[PDB]
Amino acid sequence: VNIGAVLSTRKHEQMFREAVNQANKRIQLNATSVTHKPNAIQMALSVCEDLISSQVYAILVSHPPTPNDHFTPTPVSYTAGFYRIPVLGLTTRMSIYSDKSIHLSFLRTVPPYSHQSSVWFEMMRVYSWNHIILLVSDDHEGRAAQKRLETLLEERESKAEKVLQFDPGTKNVTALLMEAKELEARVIILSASEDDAATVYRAAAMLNMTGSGYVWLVGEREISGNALRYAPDGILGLQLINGKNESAHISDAVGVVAQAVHELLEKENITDPPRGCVGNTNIWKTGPLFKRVLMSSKYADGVTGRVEFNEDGDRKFANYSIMNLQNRKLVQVGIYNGTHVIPNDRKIIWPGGETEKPRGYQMSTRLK
Amino acid sequence: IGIAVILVGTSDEVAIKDAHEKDDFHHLSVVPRVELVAMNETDPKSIITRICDLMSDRKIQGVVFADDTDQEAIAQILDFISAQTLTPILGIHGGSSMIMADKDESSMFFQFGPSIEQQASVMLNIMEEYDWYIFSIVTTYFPGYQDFVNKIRSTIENSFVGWELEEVLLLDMSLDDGDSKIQNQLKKLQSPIILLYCTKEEATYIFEVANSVGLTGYGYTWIVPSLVAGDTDTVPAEFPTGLISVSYDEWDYGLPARVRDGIAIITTAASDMLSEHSFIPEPKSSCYNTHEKRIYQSNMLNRYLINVTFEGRNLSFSEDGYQMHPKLVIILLNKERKWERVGKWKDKSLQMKYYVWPRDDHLSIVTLEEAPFVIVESVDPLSGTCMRNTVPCQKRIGYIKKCCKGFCIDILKKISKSVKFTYDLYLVTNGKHGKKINGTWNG
Amino acid sequence: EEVLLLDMSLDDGDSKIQNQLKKLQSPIILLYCTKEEATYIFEVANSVG
Amino acid sequence: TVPQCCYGFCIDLLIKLARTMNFTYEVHLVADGKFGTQERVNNSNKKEWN
Ligand SMILES: *[C@@H]1O[C@H](CO)[C@@H](O)[C@H](O)[C@H]1NC(C)=O
Numbered sequence: 001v002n003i004g005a006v007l008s009t010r011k012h013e014q015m016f017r018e019a020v021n022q023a024n025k026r027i028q029l030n031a032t033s034v035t036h037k038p039n040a041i042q043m044a045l046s047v048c049e050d051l052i053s054s055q056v057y058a059i060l061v062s063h064p065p066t067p068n069d070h071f072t073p074t075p076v077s078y079t080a081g082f083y084r085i086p087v088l089g090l091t092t093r094m095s096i097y098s099d100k101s102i103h104l105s106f107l108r109t110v111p112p113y114s115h116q117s118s119v120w121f122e123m124m125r126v127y128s129w130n131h132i133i134l135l136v137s138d139d140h141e142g143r144a145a146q147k148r149l150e151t152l153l154e155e156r157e158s159k160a161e162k163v164l165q166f167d168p169g170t171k172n173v174t175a176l177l178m179e180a181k182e183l184e185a186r187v188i189i190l191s192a193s194e195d196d197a198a199t200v201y202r203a204a205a206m207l208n209m210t211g212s213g214y215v216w217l218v219g220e221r222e223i224s225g226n227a228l229r230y231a232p233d234g235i236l237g238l239q240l241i242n243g244k245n246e247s248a249h250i251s252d253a254v255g256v257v258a259q260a261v262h263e264l265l266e267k268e269n270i271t272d273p274p275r276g277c278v279g280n281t282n283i284w285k286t287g288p289l290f291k292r293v294l295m296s297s298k299y300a301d302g303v304t305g306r307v308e309f310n311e312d313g314d315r316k317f318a319n320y321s322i323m324n325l326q327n328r329k330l331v332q333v334g335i336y337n338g339t340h341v342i343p344n345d346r347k348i349i350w351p352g353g354e355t356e357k358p359r360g361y362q363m364s365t366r367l368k
Numbered sequence: 369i370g371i372a373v374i375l376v377g378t379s380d381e382v383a384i385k386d387a388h389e390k391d392d393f394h395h396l397s398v399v400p401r402v403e404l405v406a407m408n409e410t411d412p413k414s415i416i417t418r419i420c421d422l423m424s425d426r427k428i429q430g431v432v433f434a435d436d437t438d439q440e441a442i443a444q445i446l447d448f449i450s451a452q453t454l455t456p457i458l459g460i461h462g463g464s465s466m467i468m469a470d471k472d473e474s475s476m477f478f479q480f481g482p483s484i485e486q487q488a489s490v491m492l493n494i495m496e497e498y499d500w501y502i503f504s505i506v507t508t509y510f511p512g513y514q515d516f517v518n519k520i521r522s523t524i525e526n527s528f529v530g531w532e533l534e535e536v537l538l539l540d541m542s543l544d545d546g547d548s549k550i551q552n553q554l555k556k557l558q559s560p561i562i563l564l565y566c567t568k569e570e571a572t573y574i575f576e577v578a579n580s581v582g583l584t585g586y587g588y589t590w591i592v593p594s595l596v597a598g599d600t601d602t603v604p605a606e607f608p609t610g611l612i613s614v615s616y617d618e619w620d621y622g623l624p625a626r627v628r629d630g631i632a633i634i635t636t637a638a639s640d641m642l643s644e645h646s647f648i649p650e651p652k653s654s655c656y657n658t659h660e661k662r663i664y665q666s667n668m669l670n671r672y673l674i675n676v677t678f679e680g681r682n683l684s685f686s687e688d689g690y691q692m693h694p695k696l697v698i699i700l701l702n703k704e705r706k707w708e709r710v711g712k713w714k715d716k717s718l719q720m721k722y723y724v725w726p727r728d729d730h731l732s733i734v735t736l737e738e739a740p741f742v743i744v745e746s747v748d749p750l751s752g753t754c755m756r757n758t759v760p761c762q763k764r765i766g767y768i769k770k771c772c773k774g775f776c777i778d779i780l781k782k783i784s785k786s787v788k789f790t791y792d793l794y795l796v797t798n799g800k801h802g803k804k805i806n807g808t809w810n811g
Numbered sequence: 812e813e814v815l816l817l818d819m820s821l822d823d824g825d826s827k828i829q830n831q832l833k834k835l836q837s838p839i840i841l842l843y844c845t846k847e848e849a850t851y852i853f854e855v856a857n858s859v860g
Numbered sequence: 861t862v863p864q865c866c867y868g869f870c871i872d873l874l875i876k877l878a879r880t881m882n883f884t885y886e887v888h889l890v891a892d893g894k895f896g897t898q899e900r901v902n903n904s905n906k907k908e909w910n
């Protein structure tokens with residue numbers, strides 16, 4: 001009747017316990033938390049031991065310092081998927097945990113990075129932009145973002161002018177920039193890691209690729225750290241409202257788990273989860289039902305707003321903030337409330353310093 | 369080198385190990401060793417502990433895995449272990465054998481099995497064999513459907529054959545309230561072939577809905593990948609009779625054969641590493657906290673594991689983890705809810721044992737070669753099949769397509785169109801026209 | 812083109828009704844039955860399309 | 861790529877079209893010297909024009 005938590009600090013575990021206790025007053029279930037470990041194998045062994053010690057209906061996972069999302073929550077999800085025990089992620093947007101083929105019984109509290117592609121659609125309709133180019137990286141995240149953008153564009157019968165890809169970690173992207181320079185398109189959309197984004201920023205503004213026109217659109221990882229340090233003025237980045245916050249995510253996760261447990265308690269034929277990985281090898285026989293109950297659960301009102309789960313177990317109806325870099329600063333110029341984008345009363349600058357939105361399309365008069 | 373072979377649950381006996389001793393591997397310079405380990409737990413903690421004990425206590429570098437259950441989490445756990453331990457792991461005959469896409473980077477985990485693209489290519493070859501150029505596509509919101517559709521469309525576009533590809537469906541199936549929507553969009557499948565792609569649980573519901581609509585019958589054929597079939601002996605009382613599926617070779621492939629193949633692959637990779645770039649023939653084992661394993665430089669060894677000949681077998685793998693030249697079989701749902709092997713798929717070939725594809729208005733016709741009446745040409749070298757004014761023509765003695773034509777052929781075509789009947793032309797073997805010899809006819 | 816009988820007395824061949832009904836390619840159908848049988852036939856035809 | 865001179869009916873039509881709608885041009889000859897048809901490549905069986 002208890003739930004498991006894997007946080008990154010003792011304070012986080014105490015906060016989770018306090019939140020679960022508070023939600024209890026609104027059964028005798030009590031919380032259980034385990035800290036992270038440097039070794040992935042050690043983390044898997046610890047999670048297995050915790051599961052064996054007491055039956056767990058749901059497991060929450062967080063991100064410690066030096067996240068390395070590619071392998072931080074992966075062991076927990078892999079261990080929990082054997083018995084089909086739902087696992088909720090607190091701060092993870094790698095987009096690899098969305099496919100049910102690999103990660104089974106997984107839920108998200110924050111939208112993945114790929115969903116940012118949707119954010120680059122209202123700006124495509126409110127600014128009258130039709131010719132764009134993509135600098136997506138060559139990896140799962142970049143492929144997912146490109147696929148989502150192409151699917152969104154195909155609805156209106158207008159796809160990207162040219163989609164280019166670059167191997168991750170490359171130190172020479174001059175060829176791609178030169179190829180994309182003569183394309184009669186001024187809107188540039190980038191989707192890469194911090195180091196890759198910083199590398200692309202260098203050797204790009206060198207060939208007058210910044211200034212007049214040349215609207216730049218990026219996500220959230222691009223404007224951060226080294227990439228942000230080298231980011232040119234007029235960059236239109238996206239920021240998550242409550243992505244950094246952890247206590248709020250814990251509170252909403254606890255509330256949703258409690259609501260799902262209360263809803264499931266009414267139903268009959270509720271088989272108890274196995275009391276130990278060793279010996280037990282059959283499926284829970286109720287994991288799919290608990291996952292279905294957890295999904296499609298319209299939470300009344302959480303600290304981070306309305307809680308909705310997508311068909312892939314991802315966060316639904318999120319809120320983004322549009323940031324425009326200017327004078328080595330960052331200011332908010334609009335808010336995307338999941339379905340639409342509303343600008344604020346602040347002026348929007350452009351890479352060329354103009355006060356009017358560039359057309360973003362330069363037709364060529366020299367024909368071959 | 370020491371390769372550990374792990375068997376879980378019911379398996380063979382130590383006799384298989386004998387095949388690992390009296391073989392070309394022993395005579396090779398690799399001089400490998402085998403330490404068979406049998407387990408009956410099949411749990412993540414148990415598997416991890418066994419792997420760690422084998423790696424630490426014993427000096428080994430390669431692992432061959434073979435389970436008995438159908439749990440797919442075993443493959444993911446093996447991939448995770450390989451990524452962490454930085455040691456090659458081969459999964460065969462079980463959950464580890466199930467093909468999983470999007471493997472973790474720097475993970476040297478391989479398994480026996482085909483990909484979605486290979487199954488789509490096999491389906492297209494089967495369709496082209498019997499001249500089924502009109503079909504549709506039905507899929508659901510399941511991972512891999514995009515790759516399936518893209519492969520089908522790419523194959524159709526880059527070909528000189530005349531395909532149809534009338535309609536393609538999505539079948540959300542996620543909204544419970546939209547139950548009638550599935551039936552509404554299912555009334556557009558006039559094409560004979562369907563080529564469904566979905567999970568077994570969704571497959572049963574889709575089949576029931578189609579039967580309610582009336583898409584299951586003598587005039588409609590369904591082809592599905594191995595995912596829909598699942599367990600061969602677990603027909604859910606709803607699959608229409610005559611369903612065609614593509615599966616991996618599970619009958620003419622023994623567990624000892626797979627173990628020998630894995631041992632040979634590992635030994636050949638080790639020998640190739642020793643011969644070329646002999647700086648480090650085989651890195652030593654390790655333990656927990658493998659961060660100091662960068663000295664091993666397994667990247668060089670990884671490129672060698674994707675090239676194995678084995679006395680003319682081409683056991684090379686792919687950069688993803690699936691073998692490039694697998695063995696595939698075509699199964700058909702018999703009348704008494706059974707699956708029978710109809711044909712096998714070689715590297716680039718097809719050995720279907722049915723030349724007519726047996727199931728009222730369908731009769732056979734015999735023709736003879738004549739100068740102005742029945743001219744027997746050959747298939748078109750450009751597209752591989754005949755074209756306008758020509759019809760398929762069998763040739764007994766096993767057969768060979770000829771695509772006959774001529775005046776009598778045109779008359780037969782017009783007569784068939786007028787009377788609305790189907791046929792299958794074939795040439796005669798003995799006797800030209802017919803004469804009573806010893807009271808018996810011929811030709 | 813063709814004529815049908817649609818013997819509704821034997822419901823065991825109900826699956827056949829949807830089968831033989833998916834053959835009338837002609838626009839005009841010229842149905843003839845009772846009101847209840849007419850409603851049943853119309854529902855089956857709508858399901859078939 | 862020898863820079864030869866070219867003229868004729870097509871050149872006159874191109875000059876008139878360029879004069880009508882303001883745009884410059886850069887004429888060059890086709891490499892294989894063929895109008896174009898769909899053919900098959902020996903490797904990869906990639907159907908393409910020429
Ligand atoms: C309370 O939490 C602790 C975790 O330290 C756990 O061992 C114990 O089983 C929990 N109590 C109940 C009744 O589950």
Ligand SMILES: *[C@@H]1O[C@H](CO)[C@@H](O)[C@H](O)[C@H]1NC(C)=O
Nearest residue numbers: 244245246247248249251303
């Ligand atoms: C996180 O959210 C909580 C609300 O529960 C708030 O009190 C806290 O200040 C937030 N932290 C940051 C860094 O915004």
Ligand SMILES: *[C@@H]1O[C@H](CO)[C@@H](O)[C@H](O)[C@H]1NC(C)=O
Nearest residue numbers: 317336337338339340341342
């Ligand atoms: C988002 O804001 C727009 C303002 O134009 C409003 O029409 C829409 O209903 C809002 N949607 C949500 C989910 O708040």
Ligand SMILES: *[C@@H]1O[C@H](CO)[C@@H](O)[C@H](O)[C@H]1NC(C)=O
Nearest residue numbers: 365878879880881882883884
């Ligand atoms: C081309 O000529 C037109 C006159 O019809 C003029 O309006 C336009 O500016 C010219 N374009 C140039 C000079 O690039």
